[PDB]
Design a binder for this molecule. Sequence first.
Ligand SMILES: *[C@@H]1O[C@H](CO)[C@@H](O[C@@H]2O[C@H](CO)[C@@H](O[C@@H]3O[C@H](CO[C@H]4O[C@H](CO)[C@@H](O)[C@H](O)[C@@H]4O)[C@@H](O)[C@H](O[C@H]4O[C@H](CO)[C@@H](O)[C@H](O)[C@@H]4O)[C@@H]3O)[C@H](O)[C@H]2NC(C)=O)[C@H](O)[C@H]1NC(C)=O
Ligand SMILES: *[C@@H]1O[C@H](CO)[C@@H](O[C@@H]2O[C@H](CO)[C@@H](O)[C@H](O)[C@H]2NC(C)=O)[C@H](O)[C@H]1NC(C)=O
Ligand SMILES: *[C@@H]1O[C@H](CO)[C@@H](O)[C@H](O)[C@H]1NC(C)=O
Lengths: 49, 49, 49, 49, 49
Amino acid sequence: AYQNLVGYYSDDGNYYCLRACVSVPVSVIYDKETKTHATLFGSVACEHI
Amino acid sequence: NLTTITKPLKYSYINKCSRLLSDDRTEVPQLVNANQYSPCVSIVPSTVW
Amino acid sequence: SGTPPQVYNFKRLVFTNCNYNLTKLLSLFSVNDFTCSQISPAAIASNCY
Amino acid sequence: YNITEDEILEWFGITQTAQGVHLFSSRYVDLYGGNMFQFATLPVYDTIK
Amino acid sequence: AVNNNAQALSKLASELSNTFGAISASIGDIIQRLDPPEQDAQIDRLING
Ligand SMILES: *[C@@H]1O[C@H](CO)[C@@H](O[C@@H]2O[C@H](CO)[C@@H](O[C@@H]3O[C@H](CO[C@H]4O[C@H](CO)[C@@H](O)[C@H](O)[C@@H]4O)[C@@H](O)[C@H](O[C@H]4O[C@H](CO)[C@@H](O)[C@H](O)[C@@H]4O)[C@@H]3O)[C@H](O)[C@H]2NC(C)=O)[C@H](O)[C@H]1NC(C)=O
Ligand SMILES: *[C@@H]1O[C@H](CO)[C@@H](O[C@@H]2O[C@H](CO)[C@@H](O)[C@H](O)[C@H]2NC(C)=O)[C@H](O)[C@H]1NC(C)=O
Ligand SMILES: *[C@@H]1O[C@H](CO)[C@@H](O)[C@H](O)[C@H]1NC(C)=O
């Protein structure tokens, strides 16, 4: 309904889906007056290095 | 270095084209639409002499 | 080939499901003027339709 | 156009765009049923009234 | 309330499809299919929207 190509019929007769090139959004945690910070990758297992 | 193509007699265009009604007293100017043909194409020959 | 007809008698060539190459086509043209509205002049060379 | 023979109700469709005349049939795709899919393009010179 | 949250998210997920007066909803297609000086204006319009 949102005018996006959900899938495709290829020339071999094999149908395929395409969704997105999803990449992990990142948040940062930081503490004032102790100059320390760390990074969080949400909704993803520890797979992206 | 290209002579195989031919050339027409002369350039020509339609400076005035109109429709006259049955009363022969009211004049309708013509408008050509996007990628269409005027009614005056049906009345003007291939070349204007 | 042929004779280029008049401006009010223009010949239209339509292309669907084939291959074009303006590299072998625009080179043989002595183009006086090259304007492209709502589109770049290089878009017709590369982008597919 | 070669089509098969049957006793099934079908649909025939005539329309036009600036591309030319577009002719539609239901036999090519939804022969077991009734839809309307594109099967012919016609290089007309002008729109039909 | 659940549908309210869902439609609030669908507001964000839907308005990317809207061109906001531009000619295409893909910025990469905009910068590929157009020359820089007018694609700057088109991008500026869609950024404003
Ligand atoms: C005039 O009379 C003739 C015959 O008396 C009718 O012709 C038959 O019409 C029916 C109705 O469409 C056809 O039935 C269709 O069968 C399909 C499956 O058949 C395949 O597999 C069998 C073997 O199992 C083969 O023999 C056959 O050739 C096919 O390869 C179904 O898939 C069709 O269902 C589809 O359409 C219906 C709606 O109609 C949907 O609900 C389904 O979901 C699906 O999309 C369909 O049921 C039958 O094949 C025809 N036979 C012949 C010999 O032509 C005419 O229809 C009838 N005309 C009128 C106007 O009444
Ligand atoms: C379309 O057909 C009509 C019908 O013949 C043509 O009209 C004739 O045009 C000639 C001039 O070329 C006149 O001398 C005749 O009197 C016209 N006859 C009628 C019945 O109108 C018309 O020229 C044709 N147009 C094209 C573009 O072929
Ligand atoms: C269509 O019918 C004509 C007439 O008999 C025949 O010459 C032609 O080979 C047919 N084409 C196909 C694809 O059946």
